[PDB]
Design a protein around this ligand. Sequence first.
Ligand SMILES: CCOC(=O)c1c(-c2ccccc2)oc2ccc(O)c(CN3CCC(C)CC3)c12
Length: 270
Amino acid sequence: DGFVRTLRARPEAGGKVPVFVFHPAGGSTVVYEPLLGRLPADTPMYGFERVEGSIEERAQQYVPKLIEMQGDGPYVLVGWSLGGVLAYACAIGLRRLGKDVRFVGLIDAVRAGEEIPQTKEEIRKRWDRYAAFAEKTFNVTIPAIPYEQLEELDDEGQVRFVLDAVSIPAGIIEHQRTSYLDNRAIDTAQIQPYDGHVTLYMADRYHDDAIMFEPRYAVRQPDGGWGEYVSDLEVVPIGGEHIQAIDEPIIAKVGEHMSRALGQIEADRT
Ligand SMILES: CCOC(=O)c1c(-c2ccccc2)oc2ccc(O)c(CN3CCC(C)CC3)c12
């Protein structure tokens, strides 16, 4: 219904605390089905799908829905990839409104090892990189990039400008557009500090295609970039690559750890 997917519905009344999961870059919350199978029986789960805007603007849409569904709390918020950033943003908004947030789970939602500057120089370097790949892939020499026109466009306007040159089945255009926009959303996220507990499940590395797009993701800090914003930070190493973190077998380890946290939350209510 709308942007909320029901993965496992909560009972008519009572029951366990729901897990709210948030979509990853370029995908939907169906990716959380393996995690769900590794959580306690009868754990409700609701997935928040894509909405438009900056991270804060998206959280402004999610947070009223979170409160409509769960009221005062307790809130358990989880996400892989972009979803981790969205969950974190929702935790800050809920906490601001005095709601009880008991768990924020970031599944390999790791910041770039060096801050990604949001400057005209970086816009130029980014698009020079993209053009070079376009030339080796589509086997076409590409002329001078109109830097002045690009540098005054939002990310959404930049892809519109790109679709023009191209002039693709609508389905392929929608997937590339939303994946590009969701990834840029990760790049430009401005993280605010959070004073609750955050659990970061950390893989060993980003995938090669990710690193080719933005080489700053080739390096990971021990705290995944979150320690300066989060004082109460716990990191759970899971190994492997980012893309595998959401799936079996690695998700079993995320799920075992998260199940224990949920059990404690349940005991603290009871
Ligand atoms: C799958 C490779 O394509 C990407 O990671 C990026 C895409 C993209 C993916 C699929 C289809 C079309 C585009 O767009 C990006 C824009 C900026 C950017 O930095 C990246 C690289 N990622 C940013 C966020 C990191 C957590 C992961 C890397 C992309």
